[PDB]
Amino acid sequence: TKVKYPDGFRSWYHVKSMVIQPGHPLENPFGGIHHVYANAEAIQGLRGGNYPDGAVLVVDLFDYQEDNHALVEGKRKLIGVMERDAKRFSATGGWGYEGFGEGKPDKRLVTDGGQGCFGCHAAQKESQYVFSRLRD
Amino acid sequence: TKVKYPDGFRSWYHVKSMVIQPGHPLENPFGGIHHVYANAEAIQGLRGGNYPDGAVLVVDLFDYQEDNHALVEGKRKLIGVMERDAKRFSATGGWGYEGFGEGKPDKRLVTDGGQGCFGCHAAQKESQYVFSRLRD
């Protein structure tokens, strides 16, 4: 019932990025430059398929330094992870939710079995609980 | 003598990202959110391995919108492309330089054989004319 650390996620398909700046409703703790990654099975669901068990989405969050009108990636702050298993993660709509502080496998951030993560993703039920949209 | 359109570059390894905002000296035309991608041969050279001929780096440049203290990816502005061929592109340091407007294969931008591109990259001679560094 624990989400697996997604080893090698940095080699996956880059879905999209976004910058969350101070004042954003999600600043604490989602502030920074983030990058969304999808493994092969998550790409099937992003394309309009059903998400197969074993699909994984990662959101990779960096601090940034504002220097002379550029935002430059600093240290990794954390990753968020969604792992598809319709049966094992039935209590959170079929996705297991975990955070890893600094992207480190032993820094688990989720303390409520992912109910809080799931509560916000629940608004996205019609897209199988995923916010991010596939773009060219 | 021409740089190939890098078909499928969106599936390649994501090296890094940066945001260039108004006031930045490079705002015209490099303003926006950009993502750097590297094919297998480029990853060899970024590793502290010497770039094989056939190495390709892509810089993918999006306009962004302000959305309540978030910077959100907008329309693609252009891609910049560096293709490695020590002999064919010897006049610009072994890299061929091309731009594609809106990332469209039919909207080639470079008119001077890439001498303008090369002139800015020349300051990176000690890293084989590549600015971007590999990161975790």
Ligand code: HEC
């Ligand atoms: C709202 C109050 C949220 C809470 C609580 C959590 N997340 Fe989040 N997450 C949120 C948004 C608006 C987005 C989209 C960002 C974008 O660039 O469009 C995300 C994104 C993710 C992702 C990427 C997949 C996706 O659904 O787009 C993952 C893997 C993710 N979030 C994980 C995650 C976890 C594990 C959470 C609890 C620790 C969590 N999120 C909380 C908004 C919100």
Ligand code: HEC
């Ligand atoms: C300075 C005056 C530049 C000119 C002219 C051009 N480019 Fe550029 N480029 C520049 C910087 C500072 C960077 C690094 C951005 C970052 O995030 O660190 C880049 C990056 C690229 C890349 C990525 C590979 C790399 O060297 O890091 C490519 C493929 C690239 N640029 C292509 C390119 C082309 C085709 C140009 C002329 C049309 C060109 N660049 C001009 C700065 C400058």
Ligand SMILES: [Zn+2]
């Ligand atoms: Zn405000």
